[PDB]
Design an enzyme around this catalytic site. Structure first.
Site, PDB file in Angstrom:
ATOM      1  N   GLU A  35       7.380   4.727  81.851  1.00 43.88           N
ATOM      2  CA  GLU A  35       6.367   5.384  82.672  1.00 43.88           C
ATOM      3  C   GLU A  35       5.188   4.468  82.955  1.00 43.88           C
ATOM      4  O   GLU A  35       4.684   4.443  84.082  1.00 43.88           O
ATOM      5  CB  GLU A  35       5.867   6.652  81.990  1.00 43.88           C
ATOM      6  CG  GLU A  35       6.885   7.778  81.908  1.00 43.88           C
ATOM      7  CD  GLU A  35       7.154   8.437  83.247  1.00 43.88           C
ATOM      8  OE1 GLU A  35       6.556   8.021  84.257  1.00 43.88           O
ATOM      9  OE2 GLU A  35       7.977   9.366  83.296  1.00 43.88           O
ATOM     10  N   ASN A  46       1.142  10.335  93.735  1.00 48.41           N
ATOM     11  CA  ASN A  46       2.347  11.024  94.178  1.00 48.41           C
ATOM     12  C   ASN A  46       2.219  11.420  95.649  1.00 48.41           C
ATOM     13  O   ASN A  46       1.136  11.412  96.228  1.00 48.41           O
ATOM     14  CB  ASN A  46       2.583  12.283  93.336  1.00 48.41           C
ATOM     15  CG  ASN A  46       2.695  11.988  91.851  1.00 48.41           C
ATOM     16  OD1 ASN A  46       3.397  11.062  91.450  1.00 48.41           O
ATOM     17  ND2 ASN A  46       2.005  12.779  91.027  1.00 48.41           N
ATOM     18  N   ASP A  48       2.485  14.303  97.090  1.00 50.39           N
ATOM     19  CA  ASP A  48       1.722  15.523  97.328  1.00 50.39           C
ATOM     20  C   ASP A  48       0.221  15.336  97.158  1.00 50.39           C
ATOM     21  O   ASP A  48      -0.529  16.299  97.335  1.00 50.39           O
ATOM     22  CB  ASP A  48       2.232  16.663  96.440  1.00 50.39           C
ATOM     23  CG  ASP A  48       2.048  16.387  94.961  1.00 50.39           C
ATOM     24  OD1 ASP A  48       1.410  15.374  94.604  1.00 50.39           O
ATOM     25  OD2 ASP A  48       2.555  17.180  94.147  1.00 50.39           O
ATOM     26  N   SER A  50      -1.244  14.427  94.287  1.00 48.09           N
ATOM     27  CA  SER A  50      -1.556  14.395  92.873  1.00 48.09           C
ATOM     28  C   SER A  50      -1.424  12.963  92.366  1.00 48.09           C
ATOM     29  O   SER A  50      -0.916  12.082  93.048  1.00 48.09           O
ATOM     30  CB  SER A  50      -0.613  15.319  92.103  1.00 48.09           C
ATOM     31  OG  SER A  50       0.729  14.893  92.258  1.00 48.09           O
ATOM     32  N   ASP A  52      -0.672  10.555  88.644  1.00 52.08           N
ATOM     33  CA  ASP A  52      -0.201  10.511  87.266  1.00 52.08           C
ATOM     34  C   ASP A  52      -1.056   9.529  86.479  1.00 52.08           C
ATOM     35  O   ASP A  52      -1.396   8.457  86.983  1.00 52.08           O
ATOM     36  CB  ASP A  52       1.237  10.009  87.254  1.00 52.08           C
ATOM     37  CG  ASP A  52       2.119  10.783  88.188  1.00 52.08           C
ATOM     38  OD1 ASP A  52       2.135  12.023  88.091  1.00 52.08           O
ATOM     39  OD2 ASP A  52       2.766  10.146  89.043  1.00 52.08           O
ATOM     40  N   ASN A  59       0.686  14.349  85.056  1.00 52.94           N
ATOM     41  CA  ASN A  59       0.428  14.660  86.465  1.00 52.94           C
ATOM     42  C   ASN A  59      -0.764  15.607  86.625  1.00 52.94           C
ATOM     43  O   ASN A  59      -0.856  16.628  85.939  1.00 52.94           O
ATOM     44  CB  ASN A  59       1.691  15.311  87.036  1.00 52.94           C
ATOM     45  CG  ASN A  59       1.699  15.382  88.550  1.00 52.94           C
ATOM     46  OD1 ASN A  59       0.662  15.304  89.192  1.00 52.94           O
ATOM     47  ND2 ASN A  59       2.889  15.551  89.128  1.00 52.94           N
ATOM     48  N   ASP A 101       6.999  23.435  76.988  1.00 56.64           N
ATOM     49  CA  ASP A 101       6.932  24.438  78.041  1.00 56.64           C
ATOM     50  C   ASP A 101       8.300  24.915  78.510  1.00 56.64           C
ATOM     51  O   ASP A 101       8.382  25.638  79.509  1.00 56.64           O
ATOM     52  CB  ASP A 101       6.067  23.955  79.212  1.00 56.64           C
ATOM     53  CG  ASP A 101       6.760  22.920  80.091  1.00 56.64           C
ATOM     54  OD1 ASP A 101       7.949  22.591  79.880  1.00 56.64           O
ATOM     55  OD2 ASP A 101       6.095  22.417  81.015  1.00 56.64           O
TER      56      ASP A 101
HETATM   57  C1  LIG Z   1       5.088  15.363  82.639  1.00 59.90           C
HETATM   58  C2  LIG Z   1       4.614  14.657  83.874  1.00 59.90           C
HETATM   59  O1  LIG Z   1       3.477  14.810  84.309  1.00 59.90           O
HETATM   60  N1  LIG Z   1       5.511  13.855  84.470  1.00 59.90           N
HETATM   61  C3  LIG Z   1       5.239  13.050  85.654  1.00 59.90           C
HETATM   62  C4  LIG Z   1       5.873  13.690  86.890  1.00 59.90           C
HETATM   63  O2  LIG Z   1       5.272  14.955  87.151  1.00 59.90           O
HETATM   64  C5  LIG Z   1       5.727  12.789  88.109  1.00 59.90           C
HETATM   65  O3  LIG Z   1       6.486  13.326  89.188  1.00 59.90           O
HETATM   66  C6  LIG Z   1       6.261  11.396  87.794  1.00 59.90           C
HETATM   67  C7  LIG Z   1       6.048  10.418  88.927  1.00 59.90           C
HETATM   68  O4  LIG Z   1       6.659   9.162  88.661  1.00 59.90           O
HETATM   69  O5  LIG Z   1       5.576  10.870  86.647  1.00 59.90           O
HETATM   70  C8  LIG Z   1       5.780  11.635  85.458  1.00 59.90           C
HETATM   71  O6  LIG Z   1       7.149  11.695  85.185  1.00 59.90           O
END
Ligand SMILES: CC(=O)N[C@@H]1[C@@H](O)[C@H](O)[C@@H](CO)O[C@@H]1O
Ligand SMILES: [Cl-]
Ligand SMILES: [Cl-]
Ligand SMILES: [Cl-]
Ligand SMILES: [Cl-]
Ligand code: NA
Length: 129
Positions: A35, A46, A48, A50, A52, A59, A101
């Site tokens: 990650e 992202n 949308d 948002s 990360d 996210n 969750d």
């Molecule tokens: C648990 C969490 O927030 N996971 C995020 C996911 O939502 C997002 O789409 C992705 C993008 O690469 O990064 C992480 O996987």
């Protein structure tokens, strides 16, 4: 902060992630590697709108407030910037909420695609824990 592999493993173990909800420590290290490349300051935007944040790429659509993701939730009740600190506590505490969750670690796309079903113990091999 850019963690070393074993340094992060020991930090996560201290914060209670080893076997948390049945996920062995190597799962958490593998997820952080793919990650964020172990970098607490990693951010990625992202499609949308948002973003990360942090070592586990949490996210802002659901989990933290960054002030620029309209209509989003802040289920971890934290500013997203808290997830970028050198102290991984805020990220770990939020991740424990996420993995609980119902969807487990499938919430982390990189875990699903690059860690799930592999020998994740390799990620903690050699480390003094
Ligand atoms: C648990 C969490 O927030 N996971 C995020 C996911 O939502 C997002 O789409 C992705 C993008 O690469 O990064 C992480 O996987
Ligand atoms: Cl493991
Ligand atoms: Cl917002
Ligand atoms: Cl820490
Ligand atoms: Cl699960
Ligand atoms: Na949010």
């Amino acid at each position: 902060k850019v963690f070393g592999r074993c340094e992060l493993a020991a930090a996560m173990k201290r914060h209670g992630l080893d076997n948390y909800r049945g996920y062995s420590l190597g799962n958490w290290v593998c997820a952080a590697k793919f990650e964020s490349n172990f970098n607490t300051q990693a951010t990625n935007r992202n499609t949308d709108g948002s973003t990360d944040y942090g070592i586990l790429q949490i996210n802002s659509r659901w989990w933290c407030n960054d002030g620029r993701t309209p209509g989003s939730r802040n289920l971890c009740n934290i500013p997203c910037s808290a997830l970028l600190s050198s102290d991984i506590t805020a990220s770990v505490n939020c991740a424990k909420k996420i993995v609980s969750d119902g969807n487990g670690m499938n919430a982390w796309v990189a875990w699903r695609n690059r860690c799930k079903g592999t020998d994740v113990q390799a990620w903690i091999r050699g480390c003094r824990l």
